[PDB]
Design a protein around this ligand. Structure first.
Ligand code: 6PG
Ligand code: 6PG
Ligand code: CA
Ligand code: CA
Lengths: 541, 541
């Protein structure tokens, strides 16, 4: 009996036939109406296909929904992950409010704070040289072993905050079971000077098991002494009994909890590799930036609430325009893993076909998230954004000031960002193009033959999110805005954003195929479909 | 008057209601019918939503189209890029047939061969130490400066063929105008031991101008002598008069031609950075692998022609299912830039709204290409591939043998690849899930509450392309298959795959915004829409 977001009313808001050029021409308050600020982030949604009536309608849907209650439930530790019967408490990992919070018997404030202090102490001990390897040498390299939620957030943040690296440690990320991943690290690190991190909430993920066993074999090939594991491995898990079983003791184990989703885990002990690159102080700033956004989201009326507006725009488009993707365009090299990161956070959350009650939904839910760094994308897929015939909402991320003094480069980067959103909005008409071709020296026959191919239809929507700089704090705020957008969309679709029963299945598949690959007389091999069977046959011969 | 590909007939082939499980159960020739081989590439399209009637219908469309003629025209140098009045001759860059080919007065065989010999000589001179820097030191580092087509192919191939690196040179890629790109290279290279490559077909691209000027300033800050440019820069262009104007002489300029599209240019002198990593012999093998596929495509009847089948499947889905994206899943770390590369090749080619005649088309053309490396994607967006409600065709790329002896890792990587396609095909029904939950120890109430959330609908399509290994040759074959797929789709849609009037516009935009940013009294500033104006105001203050 939840409110239906994608209803007949939405399908018909589109009939307003918004013309963005006309709106900016006629409404001198357009930017004031359709932009928001949060500290030093400027959120400009004014190039979206909305006017007051459409935004009002969308906000009414949010107000009529369970969203207000669901926000409170999330922060209070209610078990909103209803299919796994878990709280959803990534927010608590970065809390600065210190309000009381007791969940399933645990003082969450105390638990979070104590574990941070343990990570901070480990980083300090390693960076200061108090932690030595088994042969007594100072550590110079950190290798994180993990996949998915135990890999991509730390990897993305370490890159994004490269200018802030300050520990004299090189941090490497091993993830894929493809041994190329492990080898890229092992080829450049020395067993006597490397600390290995086994990052795994479950401690039973195939890839991370195989990679950790292989890394341990490499370490022990060198030292020929099992006692060396103590100086060269730590673990991060919710499953401490399983860590001990691998050979790492509790004093070398760092906790996370069931209420930390992998794709929302960089804020937890899983982020230790981030601290090892940028120092713990900068890791605290990353968390504080997210807290600022958490407070904004929790406390702000929906009409002025950035994540809510992000979510309403996105779901409006995917409902009313039947779009099946969204483009995210970060105009900063440091954000080269940001699309990949959000692709996981978004699609793994909201790629769901049933509602909370288990009913198959008759409306589309999460769509594909993709994109690429600017300005490079302008040379590639922006062609399709300008002249294809696919409706695609676009977010640009711009950073006002960079980390260097090549001011001409930075000005050009921003000019291009703003030009691209402007060009999506205006396009270029046949008449404009034709007259420009004549002015360039083409005769009338030539200009008539070419002009239609240069028409850019325009009236295509975009949002621009402008940060003052890309610091630990502003990056943390930026990620948190999208975390909450994803949450709001899930609420409005009445799905569970926090389970992943397709990912869970993936972790159990192909034990059967491995068995088949190793014995063609097995039941497993006999029961194969023939496509799988002939693929296996081809990798044998 | 071209044949309409997306017609009523296609929309109705879907009514066959293909059930993949049922097809494999009942048809013991399914794999034989719906797979092809080209040398050591196996193309298995049998998990697609086709049967004989659907494939026949699609092949009839190809046979009825202009495709047969268009293939001949492409290879013969006809001006199939009709809006720029250019030939489309990336094929000629890798030719081994030596058949006569004269285009716009040039012997293309002689031109291509002579330029290869020049690149080969440069690489040999640099690697042998015959080429010295201005202070007499051997070169140790190569920096390619270029963007889009002058960046991404070389960058992707250099990574993909990392195991084959053999010149003792480190190759770096500078592209974005964001000065972070240039700085990542300059921070790790020495002016006295670095050769800089200015890669630009036009020699007038904003980003590459600014990056090249900045690199030259860095070089000259060190040497304080303009004569040093001679030992530290080469250029690749179709516009040799513009190179001279920058200060590089003709003997240091390497040619490409107007008939080499940027996004099809790695095969040309633009690929020099690839040769500088892997040696010229391996670069020749890359080209030979593409030639093998060119010969396949040119000579093979459509029913057995891999690129044609790829194109027909893709366009069938995007027509009949109204899908707006395709997923590409490379199960090898070395292919980490492959999706990005093909995203450019595909979307920039086929993101077009008008046909060859300039008429606005009433059918959808190119769709979004996205994806990610396996197995990592299984932990992230595969959730949406399994349980979302978006129809998305999927290609998997598998490599039978890797470059190391971690055979357990490689077997697991392949098992996972094949398991994922198998799981897309079969899914898991309510009954299967429910009975598994009971067997795990849940009672009936608990199993009923959870089961619907674990249902995986299945009957989702995939193709698997299996290579024997990822070598220069097999990579070249792989890229060429997709080049030709894109070509075939464009033909069937009656669009020009080879222009990019949205990218061309991008290169001219925001001169106006830069002018506005530098003078708020300008006409440019006054004429701004207010969203752009307030964004500029915010990056001032
Ligand atoms: O939260 C998520 O997005 C997923 O559950 C998944 O990506 C998970 O993080 C990995 O499978 C690693 O799991 P472990 O941390 O348990 O090894
Ligand atoms: O072919 C392409 O895909 C595009 O035309 C574009 O990506 C182009 O390669 C770049 O804009 C660099 O152009 P230059 O090589 O002329 O600098
Ligand atoms: Ca209400
Ligand atoms: Ca025919």
């Amino acid at each position: 009996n939840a409110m239906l977001f994608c209803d007949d009313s939405k399908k018909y808001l589109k009939e307003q036939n918004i013309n963005l050029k006309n709106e900016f021409d006629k409404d001198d308050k357009r930017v004031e109406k359709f932009s928001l600020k949060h500290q030093n982030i400027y959120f400009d949604y004014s190039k979206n296909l909305i006017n007051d009536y459409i935004l009002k309608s969308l906000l009414e849907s949010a107000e009529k929904s369970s969203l207000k209650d669901k926000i409170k439930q999330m922060f209070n530790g209610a078990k909103i992950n209803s299919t796994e019967h878990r709280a959803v408490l990534h927010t608590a990992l970065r809390d600065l409010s210190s309000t009381p919070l007791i969940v399933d018997g645990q003082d969450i404030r105390q638990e979070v704070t104590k574990e941070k202090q343990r990570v901070k102490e480990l980083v300090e001990k390693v960076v200061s040289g108090r932690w030595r390897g088994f042969s007594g040498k100072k550590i110079t390299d950190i290798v994180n072993i993990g996949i998915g939620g135990s890999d991509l957030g730390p990897k993305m943040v370490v890159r994004a905050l490269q200018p802030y690296h300050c520990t004299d440690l090189k941090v490497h990320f091993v993830s894929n079971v493809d041994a190329d991943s492990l080898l890229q690290a092992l080829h450049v690190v020395d067993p006597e000077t490397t600390l290995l991190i086994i990052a795994s909430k479950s401690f039973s993920t195939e890839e991370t098991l195989l990679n950790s066993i292989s890394a341990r074999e490499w370490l022990l090939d060198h030292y020929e002494d099992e006692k060396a594991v103590a100086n060269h491995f730590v673990a991060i898990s919710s499953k401490l009994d399983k860590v001990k079983e691998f050979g790492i003791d509790l004093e070398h184990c760092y906790k996370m909890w069931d209420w930390v989703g992998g794709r929302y885990s960089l804020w937890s002990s899983i982020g230790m590799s981030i601290a090892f690159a940028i120092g713990y102080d900068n890791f605290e700033k990353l968390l504080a930036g997210a807290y600022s956004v958490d407070k904004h989201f929790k406390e702000t009326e929906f009409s002025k609430n950035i994540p809510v507006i992000m979510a309403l725009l996105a779901s409006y488009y995917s409902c009313t325009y039947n779009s099946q993707s969204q483009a995210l365009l970060p105009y900063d090299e440091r954000l080269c893993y940001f699309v990949d990161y959000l692709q996981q956070a978004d699609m793994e959350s909201n790629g769901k076909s049933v509602n909370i009650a288990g009913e198959t939904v008759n409306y589309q839910t999460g769509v594909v998230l993709w994109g690429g760094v600017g300005t490079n994308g302008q040379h590639a897929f922006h062609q399709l954004l300008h002249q294809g015939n696919i409706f695609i909402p676009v977010d640009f991320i711009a950073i006002a000031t960079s980390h260097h003094n090549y001011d001409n480069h930075q000005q050009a980067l921003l000019a291009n960002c703003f030009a691209q959103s402007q060009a999506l909005m205006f396009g270029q008409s046949y008449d404009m193009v034709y007259n420009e071709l004549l002015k360039s020296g083409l005769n009338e026959t030539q200009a008539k033959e070419l002009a239609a191919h240069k028409v850019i239809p325009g009236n295509r929507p975009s949002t621009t999110i402008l940060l003052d700089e890309l610091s630990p704090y502003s990056l943390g705020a930026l990620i948190a805005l999208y975390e909450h957008k994803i949450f709001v969309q899930g609420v409005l679709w009445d799905i569970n954003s926090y389970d992943q029963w397709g990912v869970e299945l993936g972790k159990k598949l192909g034990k059967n195929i491995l068995k088949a690959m190793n014995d063609d007389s097995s039941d497993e091999y006999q029961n194969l479909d023939d496509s799988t069977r002939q693929l296996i046959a081809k990798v044998k011969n």
